[PDB]
Design a protein around this ligand. Structure first.
Ligand SMILES: Nc1ncnc2c1ncn2[C@@H]1O[C@H](COP(=O)(O)O)[C@@H](OP(=O)(O)O)[C@H]1O
Ligand SMILES: CC1=C(/C=C/C(C)=C/C=C/C(C)=C/CO)C(C)(C)CCC1
Ligand SMILES: [Ca+2]
Ligand SMILES: [Hg+2]
Ligand SMILES: [Hg+2]
Ligand SMILES: [Hg+2]
Length: 342
């Protein structure tokens, strides 16, 4: 029984959002006592996702967006599949079901989406429309459709409270967290990539929205805390994006043990080299560049962008920096949550 009610954004909230994301067709609504920002179309499948039947062989990769999900998905898939790199050449989007991907699309507004493009005429309509149709399918139906004899790999940015309670009694999950400031910068660019932001909007406007819990799937800390509280569970592996950059081999090992898979030092070094930023970046199976031919990606933006930690310093001025510290200190008060890089 779905125990959550949703509410429209009040004038003040709606004002800050409609000033940065207004041009984009899909709208938001606050969900649950924590007021998680979810695209309106989410509500048609929220209860189903809360009650989604789960299987013991299911493996989830969850995170607040732009925290290292893609890397993790690749590592997790190769490790669960005997490091069959050849097979890993298929599109990541075909190897994983994006549970909450559908929500960004509202069929009722199909005509309004191509208008966010500089040249709506240069679209590969056949693929564009095929994209809209798949996205019209609730996430739960996608999972349910996968045959039992096929291991299900699920990607999601949904906080644990919107998914089946005790889901961890059945499935394994790897949750990624990353310094909120770099997440904001990466989320800013990602919004630019898909034409989600008003062109006349800048990063500071994006930051105001993001740290105030007015961007997609925030409040950021409530999302992280829910997973952090469950890190003790044997079926949960909480990792930090920063650690991937400090010692990927060590991280690869942690993920292998968690998945009950043993790897030789050679196998690990091979996985590490496979995730080298430049190689990974030009890896068409994961860089989503297959969508550029369609016309829905903005020039000068990429799914796999920089790959560094600490670049937020190039985007936050003195004030923003101070504002961010207060926000982080307040949310880390009375909790053992700590970020490796901070
Ligand atoms: N092999 C890799 N090594 C390091 N960072 C990587 C990577 N592949 C992707 N990333 C980074 O991970 C972030 C994407 O997160 P997610 O997959 O959850 O959406 C991006 O951050 P940046 O925008 O800072 O570059 C992206 O460039
Ligand atoms: C279907 C569709 C769109 C494309 C969405 C895409 C390509 C989403 C993939 C997102 C990822 C991979 C990031 C989260 O992890 C856009 C927004 C153009 C507008 C309308 C309908
Ligand atoms: Ca139109
Ligand atoms: Hg590590
Ligand atoms: Hg390496
Ligand atoms: Hg930098």
């Amino acid at each position: 029984p779905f125990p959550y009610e949703f509410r429209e954004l009040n004038p003040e909230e709606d004002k800050l959002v409609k000033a940065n994301l207004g041009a984009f067709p899909t709208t938001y609504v606050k969900l649950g006592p924590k007021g998680y920002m979810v695209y309106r179309p989410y509500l048609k499948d929220a209860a189903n996702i809360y009650n989604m039947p789960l299987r013991p062989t299911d493996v989830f990769v969850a995170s607040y967006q732009r925290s290292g999900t893609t890397m993790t998905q690749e590592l997790v898939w190769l490790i669960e599949n005997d490091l069959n790199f050849e097979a890993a050449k298929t599109y990541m989007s075909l190897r994983y079901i994006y549970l909450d991907g559908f929500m960004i699309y509202d069929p009722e507004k199909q005509e309004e989406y191509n208008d966010i493009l500089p040249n709506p005429e240069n679209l590969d309509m056949e693929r564009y429309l095929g994209l809209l149709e798949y996205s019209s399918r609730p996430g739960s139906s996608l999972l349910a459709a996968v045959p039992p004899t096929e291991k299900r790999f699920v990607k999601t940015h949904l906080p644990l409270s919107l998914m089946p309670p005790n889901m961890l009694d059945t499935v394994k999950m790897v949750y990624l967290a990353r310094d909120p400031r770099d997440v904001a910068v990466s989320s800013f660019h990602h919004a630019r990539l898909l034409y989600l932001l008003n062109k006349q909007s800048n990063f500071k406007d994006f930051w105001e929205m993001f740290h105030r819990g007015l961007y997609t799937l925030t409040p950021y800390f409530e999302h992280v805390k829910e997973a952090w509280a469950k890190r003790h569970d044997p079926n949960m592996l909480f990792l930090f994006y920063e650690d991937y950059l400090k010692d990927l081999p060590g991280c690869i090992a942690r993920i292998a043990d968690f998945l009950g898979k043993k790897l030789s030092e050679e196998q690990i070094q091979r996985l590490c080299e496979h995730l080298n930023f430049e190689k990974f970046k030009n890896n068409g199976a994961v860089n989503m560049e297959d969508y550029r031919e369609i016309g829905i990606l903005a020039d000068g933006e990429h799914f796999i962008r920089k790959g560094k930690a600490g670049c937020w310093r190039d985007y936050f001025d003195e004030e923003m920096t101070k504002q961010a510290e207060k926000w982080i200190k307040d949310n880390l008060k009375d909790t053992d949550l700590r970020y490796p890089n901070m």
